[PDB]
Design a protein around this ligand. Structure first.
Ligand SMILES: NC(=O)C1=CN([C@@H]2O[C@H](COP(=O)(O)OP(=O)(O)OC[C@H]3O[C@@H](n4cnc5c(N)ncnc54)[C@H](OP(=O)(O)O)[C@@H]3O)[C@@H](O)[C@H]2O)C=CC1
Lengths: 110, 297
């Protein structure tokens, strides 16, 4: 309840600040402006590379999602199995990175 | 004629035009393009300003060096008016408000200020005086604007008998309050007929009334080439601008039809071809963009 009140208060303060920033300078009457970029009028071409680094983030973030219960997993009584699977998951994250390296995947966003 | 006021040159920026103009209310919509068109001839323009000097900055590129002289004035003080008109050979009056304020109502703006300017310019030896009234000015009118403006017209005609009085109907331009009022209102349609006049035509008419000696003591009516009904005019403004603060006096003046005055001369007698709305309304309303032309009468 305290956390929800804190989130509500921070959202309310942010909304009030954006409200002041979009209402206070509008009350100046200065002048209307007539006839209100490097590219002229062209379509943004889709780049393969930005999408590749986005999907690479998504897959390694899933591997991070698997790695996140390790500070709780180190408390177990099957420590040989736990250490084996922890080293196996970090090794599979590293093998994903090595395959992303060696097949020209990290190129011009290296 | 004095030697310093003989026209020399080719009529460009650094030439001499022989016009020494005092434009009262030059910091508005008509004074902008009037000081522009006077300064491109090489005229000595005197701009009395009520506002902050920052709001006169756009009037400074409009002429050559020393050609626009800015000076302070109060609309209730005859002394500053005399200080501003005592060297001019033509005095143009463009002082107006669409609304009344706490310090100035329609009677303070349309009656007392033009009578004061015209009377002090009469006692200062000014040859040419130009007063700007509205086409729909009438004593028994529904709006206080047009009533006090007709009374001010009568007072200017009786205190400066050689004054040129000019009647534009509803002026449209980039900084207007006619097409931009319609484009942002998001009032209705009635049986109101309007013929709007274009601001460069009004400015060319004011200057050709400065230059013509036969325009002394005349009353002109500056109207556009096409009369439109109010509803399809407003719909054509919404069609060009790609769309689906006020007072009651502005509503009374939008729903007041523009009267036909055939006995008064117009822009065709001052050598000005009237520019239609269909050529310049795109130039006005391209700002409001995120077309079938309007039917006349
Ligand atoms: N649709 C139109 O444009 C039409 C206009 N007219 C008339 O033409 C004239 C000029 O029109 P427009 O450019 O649109 O008007 P604006 O409101 O745009 O300009 C008025 C000018 O007069 C000054 N002024 C206003 N009130 C006072 C005052 N009480 N004392 C001193 N100076 C004052 C303003 O200065 P400041 O910035 O300090 O207020 C400004 O320089 C007006 O008289 C108007 O009635 C006639 C027919 C149609």
């Amino acid at each position: 309840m305290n956390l929800m009140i804190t989130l509500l208060t921070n959202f309310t303060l942010a909304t009030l600040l954006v409200t002041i920033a979009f209402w206070l300078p509008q009350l100046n009457v200065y002048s209307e402006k007539t006839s209100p970029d490097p590219m002229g009028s062209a379509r943004l071409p889709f780049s393969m590379k930005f999408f590749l680094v986005a999907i690479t983030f998504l897959l390694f973030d899933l591997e991070i999602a698997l790695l996140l219960p390790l500070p709780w997993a180190s408390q177990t009584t099957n420590l040989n199995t736990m250490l084996t699977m922890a080293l196996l998951l970090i090794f599979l994250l590293a093998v994903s990175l090595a395959y992303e390296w060696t097949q020209k995947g990290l190129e011009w966003t290296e | 004629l004095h030697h310093a006021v003989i026209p020399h040159g080719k009529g460009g920026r650094s030439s001499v035009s022989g016009i020494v103009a005092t434009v009262f209310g030059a910091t508005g919509f008509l004074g902008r393009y009037l000081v522009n068109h006077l300064g491109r001839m090489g005229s000595q323009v005197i701009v009395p300003y009520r506002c902050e000097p920052y709001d006169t900055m756009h009037l400074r590129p409009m002429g050559d060096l020393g050609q626009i002289i800015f000076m302070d004035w109060n609309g209730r003080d005859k002394d500053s008016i005399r200080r501003a008109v005592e060297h001019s050979n033509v005095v143009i009056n463009l002082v107006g408000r669409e609304w009344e304020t706490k310090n100035f109502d329609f009677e303070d703006v349309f009656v007392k200020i033009p009578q004061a300017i015209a009377q002090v310019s009469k006692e200062a030896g000014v040859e040419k005086f130009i007063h700007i009234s509205h086409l729909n000015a009438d004593i028994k009118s529904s709006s206080k604007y047009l009533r006090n403006k007709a009374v001010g017209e009568k007072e200017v005609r009786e205190t400066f008998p050689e004054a040129t009085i000019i009647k534009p109907a509803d002026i449209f331009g980039r900084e207007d309050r006619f097409l931009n009022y319609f484009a942002n209102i998001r009032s209705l349609g009635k049986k109101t007929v309007k013929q709007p006049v274009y601001i460069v035509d009004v400015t060319k008419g004011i200057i050709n009334a400065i230059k013509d000696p036969d325009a002394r003591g005349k009353t002109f009516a500056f109207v556009g080439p096409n009369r439109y009904l109010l509803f399809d005019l407003v719909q054509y403004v919404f069609a060009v601008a790609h769309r689906p603060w006020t007072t009651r006096d502005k509503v009374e003046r939008i729903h007041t039809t523009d009267r036909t005055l055939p006995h008064l001369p117009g822009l065709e007698d001052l050598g000005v071809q009237a520019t239609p709305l269909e050529l310049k309304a795109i130039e006005v309303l391209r700002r409001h963009r995120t077309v079938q032309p309007a039917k006349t009468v």
